Amino acid sequence: FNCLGMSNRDFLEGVSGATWVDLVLEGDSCVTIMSKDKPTIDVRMMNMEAANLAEVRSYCYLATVSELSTKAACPTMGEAHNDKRADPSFVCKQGVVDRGWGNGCGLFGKGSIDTCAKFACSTKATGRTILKENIKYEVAIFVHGPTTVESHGNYSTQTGAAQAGRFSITPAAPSYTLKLGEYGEVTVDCEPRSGIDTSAYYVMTVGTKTFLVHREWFMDLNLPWSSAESNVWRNRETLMEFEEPHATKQSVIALGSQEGALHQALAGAIPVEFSSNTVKLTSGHLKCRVKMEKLQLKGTTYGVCSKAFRFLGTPADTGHGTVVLELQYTGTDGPCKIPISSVASLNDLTPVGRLVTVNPFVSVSTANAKVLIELEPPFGDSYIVVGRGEQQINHHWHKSGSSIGKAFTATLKGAQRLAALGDTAWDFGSVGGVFTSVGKAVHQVFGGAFRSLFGGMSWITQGLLGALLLWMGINARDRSIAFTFLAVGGVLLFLSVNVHA
Amino acid sequence: FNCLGMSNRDFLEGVSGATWVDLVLEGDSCVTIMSKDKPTIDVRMMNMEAANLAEVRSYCYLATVSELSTKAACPTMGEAHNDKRADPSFVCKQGVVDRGWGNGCGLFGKGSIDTCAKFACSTKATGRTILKENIKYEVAIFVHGPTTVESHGNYSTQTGAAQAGRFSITPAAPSYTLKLGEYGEVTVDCEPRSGIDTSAYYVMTVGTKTFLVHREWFMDLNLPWSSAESNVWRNRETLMEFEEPHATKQSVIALGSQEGALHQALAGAIPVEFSSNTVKLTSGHLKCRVKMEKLQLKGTTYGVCSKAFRFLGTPADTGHGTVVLELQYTGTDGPCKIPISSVASLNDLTPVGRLVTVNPFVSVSTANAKVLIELEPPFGDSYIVVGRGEQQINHHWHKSGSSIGKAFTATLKGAQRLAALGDTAWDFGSVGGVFTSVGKAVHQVFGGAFRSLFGGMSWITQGLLGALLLWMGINARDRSIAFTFLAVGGVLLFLSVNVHA
Amino acid sequence: FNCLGMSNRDFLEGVSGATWVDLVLEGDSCVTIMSKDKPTIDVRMMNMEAANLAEVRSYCYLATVSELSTKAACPTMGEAHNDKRADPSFVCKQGVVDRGWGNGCGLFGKGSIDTCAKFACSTKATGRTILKENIKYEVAIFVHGPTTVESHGNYSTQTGAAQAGRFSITPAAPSYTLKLGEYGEVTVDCEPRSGIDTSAYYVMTVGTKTFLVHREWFMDLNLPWSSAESNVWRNRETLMEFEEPHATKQSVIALGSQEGALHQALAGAIPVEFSSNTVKLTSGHLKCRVKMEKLQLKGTTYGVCSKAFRFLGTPADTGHGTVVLELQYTGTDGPCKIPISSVASLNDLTPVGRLVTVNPFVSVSTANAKVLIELEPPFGDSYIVVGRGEQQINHHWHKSGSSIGKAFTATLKGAQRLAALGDTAWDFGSVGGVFTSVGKAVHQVFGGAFRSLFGGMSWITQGLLGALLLWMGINARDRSIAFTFLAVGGVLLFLSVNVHA
Amino acid sequence: QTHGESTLSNKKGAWMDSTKATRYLVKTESWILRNPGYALVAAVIGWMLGSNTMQRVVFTVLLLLVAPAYS
Amino acid sequence: QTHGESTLSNKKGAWMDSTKATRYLVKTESWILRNPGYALVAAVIGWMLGSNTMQRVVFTVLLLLVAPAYS
Amino acid sequence: QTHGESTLSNKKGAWMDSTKATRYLVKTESWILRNPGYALVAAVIGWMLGSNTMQRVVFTVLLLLVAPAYS
Ligand SMILES: *[C@@H]1O[C@H](CO)[C@@H](O)[C@H](O)[C@H]1NC(C)=O
Ligand SMILES: *[C@@H]1O[C@H](CO)[C@@H](O)[C@H](O)[C@H]1NC(C)=O
Ligand SMILES: *[C@@H]1O[C@H](CO)[C@@H](O)[C@H](O)[C@H]1NC(C)=O
């Protein structure tokens, strides 16, 4: 539920007077909203869960063949028809065998045989569809308040403090309002119906492992398949092997289990948890709008801490440019505001780095209170100062990197989000915006054309075609066709590289 | 053995000046040799029984994963190493996981996870080698003598009459002189060691069925394999999937059974019979040299039958241009030769067709004796006349086709034999001559390069390459380049079509 | 704690109005700071101590080999696999040996053998990483007050006289306010986190001698290396030699101790002191800002003594333009300031040289008191007069050199400091200013590319490349490329020469 | 990797002769039917890569064959 | 065929991520190393079919990719 | 692979400062003295490979440096 320790984490700055912000809550990817005069909140979707799945088709990969029978015909008597054509669950194949006086026939030539075998496959890989009215995204919202290292990721303590909450977003109730204790209220108005295209995926259960597979890919499997709640199997001959034709008896043997072949065929599938006809997905995205009009900063009217603090342990960089440290307050006056700031120089003592934990304060009045505070120091050498005067404590910190490098990293992350989310990426961190809407429309058109043109390619095909298109654009005489060739080739090459393979 | 009623049957003619014929005995194929003043024989190889097979490599297509264990390491430190990694029969894989203050770590970053699992194979696909000192061919020779319809295929009665015999051809005994009662003796000098390219095949036993697979294909399987009498497995990562990097416990699950994937990959493999460490394959070829110098004709001392015959049924076309019929002799003249012939018209009586059963006669001295006789009537309307005078019986026969059609069919069959055997086809039915030797040498020279260049292609790519080469040769400038492109394209197209795919 | 007697010493003349100055505090160096009125101080870092080192990787340079075993296989039967293929203390290598009927085989050829040996290391070279939370510099600050020749280096007397102090600079406490008896308070705030790039070094312990090695060099060693937690070894084939493939038994030997080879490879490594899991190095630097707002003179309210002084010994040139002498005061008039000055002639007695010991005075009130005084005479001939009248004592001193040579030496030392410290050298003696900031910025911009282009090159390659670039620039046609070629060649030549190799 | 046609001069059927024709063509036809928009891309690129009709059609065929079977 | 990369915008790994790079090139490298005689054929055909160096190299690459994966 | 000069800005000596000048030259000197006949090969090849008085010298120096240190 919290944003600490996440490899993927996005920061969004709210402008002055920004009442709301559009977010795209990605699976296993927190986003932290920072605004002026408001507490910083981090909201993330934990899992998408759908119940009452409907079965559509069930392929089977392990078949059993029994009750072998064949009917032989002489070369003149035409084709042979076994009496098991009228019996379902029997697979029959017409074959040609040599017939002569040695085989008991009357003439010499190519006889006709019809070998039938009873097909009954026991282990099936059933695929199920997701009903759009049964999904329920789980979304967690947290506020950076007075927390300890030991209790920052404890959901029970944060709910006891009314600082965090797990709530379920459903198409029936897309909007949820979380009531915090003294931080106000935060309202999320999501779009669960369009968050994940359930019509584009199936829930396929192969063995003990469940996968989320493409609808088109699932229907193209070459295996014996039966519709939901039916024992009528079709394409049964794929799992059955007919041996060398023989007049007296032709042997038919079922192939080995295709469970491993299915697992190899599921290389790009997304594994999901399936239990009690309920599927849980930790991936996906959920477009949502977070409203912070009622979100009020807590502790603004508290006094400053007169007594001294201490650094319990070394601050740790989170990898996102923010630094988390724990402070122990020696005094016991009561709820007081912590005077912690990030400064470039100890003599200058001017605020140069912002605080993720906006308006930190000690909550409990005990003798020693541990407070976790997150700051965003500037690049280069800087000091983390707590208090002033004789009680002042300093902690030097060096932040490797540059603003230019941060800009390049942000551009790369934006490109990756655009590739992963498509048109939904424009909704991320957007407060209205005329540019956002026209950009989203243009990207919708371009993405539709691009998917229609190169949807099914792998990274190898995309990379090779992108290189070819770049080479063609380089040698193209006309500027416009060269420009479009270069653009398409660059997009294809980026997509091929973006898979990190 | 006998080949009355086989789709594959070859008719060789004995040169007046040659005492031996060099022929290639193929699996499920017959060669009939007809000479002047000599009995007709047909030579056929039954199978190849190679014993004492030596195991080479045993792949695993069904693994089991248990005893799951994992260990995690703090970021910016040494990568984790599980204590079970030293323990044998354990497969370990490295990975990265998000580590922070929540997980008990000290630094926020991508910690290194190392999980190991117990590998145990359930069923394995064993591969074996064929020692060239244990190859053993079963060649059978039959002489067309006094036989009935029911007794023409019984090996017991044919050996009792000393008219047929199955014998083993081994490298240590490459020659066998088959003694025939009153028919002389026929000796065959085969080539067992160079017959099958047994150094290019493995005997793979997957499940309960056994195949004959290539050596270059068997070693390319990406499955856990072990050597002979080796409990330790290698390349075990293929049957293990590491689901999601988790600091506490990363789950590892073994993939499903790969028996179906193996059967799907053994698409062009030749199924064989494997039992008691012995492989028996009925396909393949064996080049042999038949010596008919001492093969004499039986019944040349008997008198002509004086009583009347009868056709026991309508004569049947064998499909190879010959006609098989059974007569019944009502007389009691003892061993007597049957005056059967093929005449063009009933007013001519001059024999125009050739008898496959050279010098037919009645064996038993009792009445109502049945004799099977095979003839080769000419194309068009013909009569099968038996006897002469008032007891003469005739049966009109029509042989469809023409001499040019037979020539085209023979050319096509020779081309198919050349494609299937290669340079060995030139040694089929050739008693010597400079043309055969130079043709075989040229074919070896060309085929070595052809198999080096177009070696492992399927029929579809061979057909596409042939079409492309023909198109380039048509639009070529140099005559020699166009000639060679046309030749190679035609060969490729014929090879693609010869697969009949 | 003082610069007296150190070859590495730099002087900083503080400008009026500025109350602080930036320092770099190179290891085994010393910075002497003198202001217009404030007393002269010298500050240096004695060492950098880091505890709680964490093991990362342990290489092995001495290993033992035992329990030999060889498993042979016949030719064309695949590579052999010995039963001792288990991970724990067994490493195997494949090889080919001649086989035949003499060796008991069945075929002649290059049979494959697999021999394994027991791997067990005796001595290992553990590598440890430095945690930035545990580094603590030791900075010493001294004030030039009343000291003798014996008590000037005696820290016990100096710290008992409140004229010196050794304090620890930690990231959790980067600011220290040293307390002085009558000289006030001196505050120094440093940058421990960015002082020594501990994230680019390892603490390698080879035998009993410990070094500070590069991370890149340490991980590129081709020796058997284990993980941190004393696990199984890896890359063990480097310390063993497989003598000669023999069918019965192939002997495996262990290479000799690689301790000498490691010492040869540890050429540029910096030896450090290691004990009780704590490292201590006297090298490196630590950027500090010393604040002298509360630094004041001692004994300014004393009246000049009317008694006579005597020169104890001869003045000694310290090698940095300053001379140190000792005066024995013959009077008992209590604490009183020394009327000592440096003059160019004895007919004017106008002070021309600056006194390093600002406002010298006698501390004790004994009969004979020894006072050490440091002066900076002008270049050329000058006198050191103490007092006036008939009790005046003069001491002629000649200072070799010139201000032009002093400027050349200062430029050379600045260039060497810039080469050794890179961009940190721009913050030496800087009280701020816009020239220093832009110079440091452009130096960082150029130095990043310079390191990326010529990082690992040695002085020989640097010198050769600089000579080549100078030759190209001299013969270059365009003046734009000639300038940069000459600049880079000159920098490379200076770097090659600066090593004095 | 599939075994492919053997070199034993077999006159009977192999393990899978029923699928001998559709063994290699199943993937390509299914990929083309699922994603038919690629046929325009391959045709356009082949037309713009070759200066002759033969070169253009060979480019088109090769592009149509390489995309389904990615390598 | 294989499933291929999902479109769900997943941030964790797919079902088989360790084999993502080698999934489609496993057959091609094995086929090329099994019979390198075709590489001469592809180079010769591409050289004799293309008029420009770009056309020749594209033909060679397309042929070397379309022979191992037969379709 | 040797360590090389460290970037710690040390003012004292490193582990082996006495060999700091001969460490990268002993092998070259010993190799050149062992077989002076190669020096003719390097000079001739540089002279016949460079078309300018500076290119010949650079080629000769590079050839005389590459052979002693075969890496
Ligand atoms: C959260 O805190 C409560 C009370 O201290 C404790 O019982 C519980 O185990 C904690 N949960 C976790 C996950 O640490
Ligand atoms: C062949 O005929 C003999 C003699 O009657 C008999 O014993 C044997 O079983 C027969 N075999 C077959 C296959 O008909
Ligand atoms: C410093 O002076 C004290 C005076 O008792 C003496 O004992 C000590 O040895 C002196 N220090 C040194 C390093 O000589």
CSV table of C-alpha atoms in Angstrom, one decimal, chain C residues 10-168:
chain,number,residue,atom,x,y,z
C,10,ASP,CA,50.0,25.3,1.1
C,11,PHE,CA,49.3,28.8,2.4
C,12,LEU,CA,46.0,30.6,2.2
C,13,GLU,CA,45.9,34.3,2.8
C,14,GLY,CA,42.3,35.1,3.7
C,15,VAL,CA,40.8,38.2,2.2
C,16,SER,CA,39.3,40.9,4.4
C,17,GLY,CA,35.6,40.5,5.2
C,18,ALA,CA,35.5,36.8,4.3
C,19,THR,CA,34.9,34.7,7.4
C,20,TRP,CA,35.3,31.2,5.8
C,21,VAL,CA,37.4,29.5,3.1
C,22,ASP,CA,36.9,26.2,1.3
C,23,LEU,CA,39.5,23.5,1.7
C,24,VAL,CA,40.2,20.1,0.2
C,25,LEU,CA,42.5,18.6,2.9
C,26,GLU,CA,44.5,16.1,0.9
C,27,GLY,CA,46.0,13.2,2.8
C,28,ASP,CA,49.5,13.6,4.2
C,29,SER,CA,49.2,17.3,3.3
C,30,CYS,CA,48.7,20.4,5.4
C,31,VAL,CA,46.9,23.8,4.8
C,32,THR,CA,48.0,26.9,6.7
C,33,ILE,CA,45.5,29.7,6.8
C,34,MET,CA,46.4,33.2,7.9
C,35,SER,CA,44.1,36.2,8.0
C,36,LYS,CA,44.7,40.0,8.2
C,37,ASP,CA,44.3,40.0,12.0
C,38,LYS,CA,43.1,36.6,13.1
C,39,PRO,CA,45.7,34.1,14.3
C,40,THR,CA,47.2,31.6,11.9
C,41,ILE,CA,45.8,28.1,11.9
C,42,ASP,CA,46.8,24.9,10.1
C,43,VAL,CA,44.3,22.2,9.4
C,44,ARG,CA,44.8,18.7,8.0
C,45,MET,CA,43.2,15.3,7.9
C,46,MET,CA,45.3,12.7,9.6
C,47,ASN,CA,43.5,9.6,8.3
C,48,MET,CA,40.1,8.2,7.1
C,49,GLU,CA,38.8,5.3,9.3
C,50,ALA,CA,36.0,3.0,8.2
C,51,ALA,CA,34.7,0.1,10.3
C,52,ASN,CA,32.2,-2.7,9.8
C,53,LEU,CA,33.6,-3.7,6.3
C,54,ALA,CA,31.3,-6.1,4.4
C,55,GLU,CA,32.7,-9.0,2.5
C,56,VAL,CA,31.8,-9.1,-1.2
C,57,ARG,CA,34.1,-11.7,-2.9
C,58,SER,CA,37.0,-13.8,-1.7
C,59,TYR,CA,39.5,-15.0,-4.3
C,60,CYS,CA,41.8,-18.0,-3.8
C,61,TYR,CA,45.5,-18.1,-4.7
C,62,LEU,CA,46.6,-21.4,-3.1
C,63,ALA,CA,44.6,-24.6,-3.7
C,64,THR,CA,45.1,-28.3,-3.2
C,65,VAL,CA,44.2,-31.2,-5.5
C,66,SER,CA,43.5,-34.8,-4.4
C,67,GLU,CA,41.2,-37.8,-5.0
C,68,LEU,CA,42.0,-38.2,-8.7
C,69,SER,CA,39.7,-40.2,-10.9
C,70,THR,CA,39.5,-40.8,-14.6
C,71,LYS,CA,36.6,-42.4,-16.6
C,72,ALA,CA,37.4,-43.5,-20.1
C,73,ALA,CA,35.0,-44.1,-23.0
C,74,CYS,CA,35.3,-45.8,-26.4
C,75,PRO,CA,35.6,-43.7,-29.6
C,76,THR,CA,32.4,-42.6,-31.3
C,77,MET,CA,30.5,-43.2,-28.1
C,78,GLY,CA,30.2,-39.6,-26.9
C,79,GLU,CA,32.2,-37.7,-24.3
C,80,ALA,CA,32.7,-39.6,-21.0
C,81,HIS,CA,31.2,-38.4,-17.7
C,82,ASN,CA,32.9,-39.4,-14.5
C,83,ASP,CA,30.8,-40.3,-11.5
C,84,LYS,CA,32.4,-37.5,-9.5
C,85,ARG,CA,30.5,-34.8,-11.4
C,86,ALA,CA,29.0,-33.5,-8.2
C,87,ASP,CA,29.5,-29.9,-7.3
C,88,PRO,CA,31.1,-30.2,-3.8
C,89,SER,CA,34.9,-30.1,-4.2
C,90,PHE,CA,35.0,-31.8,-7.6
C,91,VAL,CA,35.8,-30.2,-10.9
C,92,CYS,CA,36.1,-32.2,-14.2
C,93,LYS,CA,37.5,-31.5,-17.6
C,94,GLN,CA,36.9,-33.4,-20.9
C,95,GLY,CA,39.7,-34.7,-23.0
C,96,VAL,CA,40.6,-37.0,-25.8
C,97,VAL,CA,43.1,-39.9,-25.7
C,98,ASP,CA,44.1,-42.5,-28.2
C,99,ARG,CA,42.2,-45.8,-27.8
C,100,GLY,CA,42.5,-49.2,-29.4
C,101,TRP,CA,42.7,-52.9,-28.8
C,102,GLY,CA,45.9,-52.4,-26.8
C,103,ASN,CA,43.9,-50.3,-24.2
C,104,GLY,CA,41.1,-52.9,-24.1
C,105,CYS,CA,38.7,-50.9,-26.4
C,106,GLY,CA,36.9,-52.2,-29.4
C,107,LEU,CA,37.5,-49.3,-31.9
C,108,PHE,CA,40.6,-47.2,-32.8
C,109,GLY,CA,40.3,-43.5,-32.5
C,110,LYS,CA,40.4,-40.5,-30.2
C,111,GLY,CA,38.4,-41.8,-27.3
C,112,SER,CA,37.0,-39.2,-24.8
C,113,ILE,CA,37.9,-39.3,-21.1
C,114,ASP,CA,36.5,-37.3,-18.1
C,115,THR,CA,38.8,-36.7,-15.1
C,116,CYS,CA,37.9,-35.0,-11.9
C,117,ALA,CA,39.9,-33.7,-9.0
C,118,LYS,CA,39.1,-32.5,-5.5
C,119,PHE,CA,39.4,-28.7,-5.1
C,120,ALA,CA,40.2,-27.3,-1.7
C,121,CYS,CA,41.8,-23.9,-1.1
C,122,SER,CA,44.3,-23.1,1.6
C,123,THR,CA,44.7,-19.3,1.6
C,124,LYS,CA,42.2,-16.8,0.2
C,125,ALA,CA,42.3,-13.1,-0.5
C,126,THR,CA,39.1,-11.6,0.9
C,127,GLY,CA,37.7,-8.4,-0.5
C,128,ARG,CA,35.5,-6.1,1.5
C,129,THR,CA,33.3,-3.1,0.6
C,130,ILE,CA,33.2,0.1,2.5
C,131,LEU,CA,29.8,1.2,3.9
C,132,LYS,CA,29.5,5.0,3.6
C,133,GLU,CA,27.6,5.1,7.0
C,134,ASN,CA,30.8,4.0,8.9
C,135,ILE,CA,33.5,6.3,7.4
C,136,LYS,CA,34.9,8.9,9.8
C,137,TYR,CA,37.7,11.3,8.9
C,138,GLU,CA,40.1,12.5,11.6
C,139,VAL,CA,40.8,16.2,11.1
C,140,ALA,CA,43.3,18.2,13.3
C,141,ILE,CA,43.3,22.0,13.7
C,142,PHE,CA,46.2,23.8,15.4
C,143,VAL,CA,46.8,27.5,16.2
C,144,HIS,CA,50.2,29.1,16.1
C,145,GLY,CA,50.6,30.3,19.7
C,146,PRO,CA,53.3,30.2,22.3
C,147,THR,CA,55.1,26.9,21.6
C,148,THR,CA,58.6,25.6,22.1
C,149,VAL,CA,60.6,23.3,19.7
C,150,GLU,CA,59.8,20.2,21.7
C,151,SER,CA,56.1,21.0,22.4
C,152,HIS,CA,55.3,22.1,18.9
C,153,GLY,CA,54.8,18.5,17.8
C,154,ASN,CA,53.8,17.1,21.2
C,155,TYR,CA,50.0,16.7,20.9
C,156,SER,CA,49.5,16.1,24.7
C,157,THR,CA,50.9,19.5,25.6
C,158,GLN,CA,49.2,21.3,22.7
C,159,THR,CA,45.8,19.8,23.6
C,160,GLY,CA,46.4,20.6,27.3
C,161,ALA,CA,47.2,24.2,26.3
C,162,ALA,CA,44.0,24.4,24.2
C,163,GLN,CA,45.9,25.1,21.1
C,164,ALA,CA,45.1,22.0,19.1
C,165,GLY,CA,42.5,19.3,18.7
C,166,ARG,CA,41.9,16.0,17.0
C,167,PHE,CA,38.2,15.4,16.1
C,168,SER,CA,36.3,12.9,14.0
